[PDB]
Amino acid sequence: GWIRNIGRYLSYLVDDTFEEYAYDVVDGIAKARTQEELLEGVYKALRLAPKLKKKAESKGCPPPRIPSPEDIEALEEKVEQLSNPKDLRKLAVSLALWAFASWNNCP
């Protein structure tokens, strides 16, 4: 459900193979109470795409893949109607939950 693809992209900010350790964005996406800050955090996480691209390119392993545009609108087609924070947490926490998965990137 377009969760693994974005989780593997968020995993690029925590893994030691990318020696930048973007942990603030993980806290922002996990600690989201309403609509605006969750989108702000996911934008901040996605903004570091060239960082990861040039880090993997300059290190040797294949560059990371950006989340596909096909499920980008899928993110906003559901979170819009999660007016209640209680059910919004089920996805806000899960976004960072999948950010710590194994996600083998470079050999």
Partner: protein, 333 residues
Amino acid sequence: FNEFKTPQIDPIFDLYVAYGYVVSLIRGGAKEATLIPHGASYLIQTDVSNEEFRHGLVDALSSMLSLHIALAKLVSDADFSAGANINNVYWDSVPRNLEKLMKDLEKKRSVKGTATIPITLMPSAGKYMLKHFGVQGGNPIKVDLLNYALAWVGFHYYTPYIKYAKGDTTWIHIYQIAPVEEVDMISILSLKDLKMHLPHYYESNLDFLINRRLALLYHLLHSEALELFTEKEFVIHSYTLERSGNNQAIRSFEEEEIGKLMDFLWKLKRRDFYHAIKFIDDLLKKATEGALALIDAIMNERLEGFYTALKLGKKAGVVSSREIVAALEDIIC
């Protein structure tokens, strides 16, 4: 139906004696035996004879004493000699009582004495009891030797426990699993499978045996007896014994539940097993605070606890694979 009655004294010691009745019956036979809880009495219904019950009890006592003689006034590092008994006098008192019971029963002679009950079998007991305007000297509470031995058999055979030394002090976590609706013999034997002997861990790396809830999680992680808790309702009564500077006292008596934790463990390990136990052990050894947050989330159904635990684990050394994350997501629903 013989329908053995169990003395109503203390719903913890009462549970121990009524819950060792089942193993006494099993060692003597007694097919189709069940346990009906009466709030605290915990009656047992079966079709066994009194002589057959006595034969099963003497078999259990023989096995226990044979185990006791393996280590050496004889003091053994066993469950019912020194592993769980925090008081030094009981280390010699209990084996003498058990062998006295063996001698009395093997001669078809009912016991005719009463003995002091230790704090291990019932934390509600102790040294002093408020009568009207003060306490009673000695140990006011006494129990008939037959029920005393039966409860000791139950505690040794069924109830899991953990001992952590850490130099001069000593912590003993004791857990007993209590049914709440109804159980048959197979269920109680499946619970008996949880008991493992000589849990005297000590060392220094395994310093996470403090925080009793974390210790019970660690113990249950490596146990794969039966996922009975998802189809039957069970509770856990647990307590800690501390010997900080020869000052024997109890500091924790919280009453948690076992169904949620077992359900969580089964749901997590259903996907991956190699990445489950290694994950949990690494997280316990490195991120103790993360483990506490995780167990709090399990017991309270809290979303932030899992994220905090994973973040703390990934900070130091935890791989935190994908399959366990997917299992957690599925549990979240």
